[PDB]
Amino acid sequence: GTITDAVDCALDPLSETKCTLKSFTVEKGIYQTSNFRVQPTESIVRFP
Amino acid sequence: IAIPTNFTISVTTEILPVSMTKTSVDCTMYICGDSTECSNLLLQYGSF
């Protein structure tokens, strides 16, 4: 009943696949993960 | 009895589908327009 290991789901794609599959051991294959998105650099406000 | 005295070689085309276009839908990006508060409520619906 003790936590022996942990996985950070945002460190590397391997840990992301581990969190997606909910397993510390990922077999050979290709797995689709969260899509990347370009975040906005700043906010633009346009008014009359 | 009727027995043919000649023959005609014919070719008939047969069309059979083998596959279709693949589909990958990002459910979070589809239901929620990259909104954080929308994703926080979408996660409450389980693993749909």
**DSSP for A9-41, written as a single string:** TTT-HHHHHHHHHT-S---SS----PPP----S
Q: Which of A10, A28, A1 is nearest to A19 (CA)?
A: A10
Contact state of B29 with A32 under an 8 Å Cβ cutoff: no
Residue type, A24: F
Q: Hey, what are A25's tokens? A: 């051991």
Q: Hey, what are B35's tokens? A: 């909104």
Selected residues 10-39 of chain B with any CB under 8 Å from a CB in chain A:
24, 26, 29, 34
- The structure's method of determination equals cryo-EM
Residues 6+ apart with CB under 8 A from A35: B26, B29
For residues B28 and B5, give the distance between their C-alpha atoms in angstroms, rounded to a whole number: 70
**Which chain A residues are closer than 8 Å to B29 by Cβ?**
35, 37
Selected residues 5-44 of chain A with any CB under 8 Å from a CB in chain B:
32, 35, 37
Residues 6+ apart with CB under 8 A from B31: B38, B42
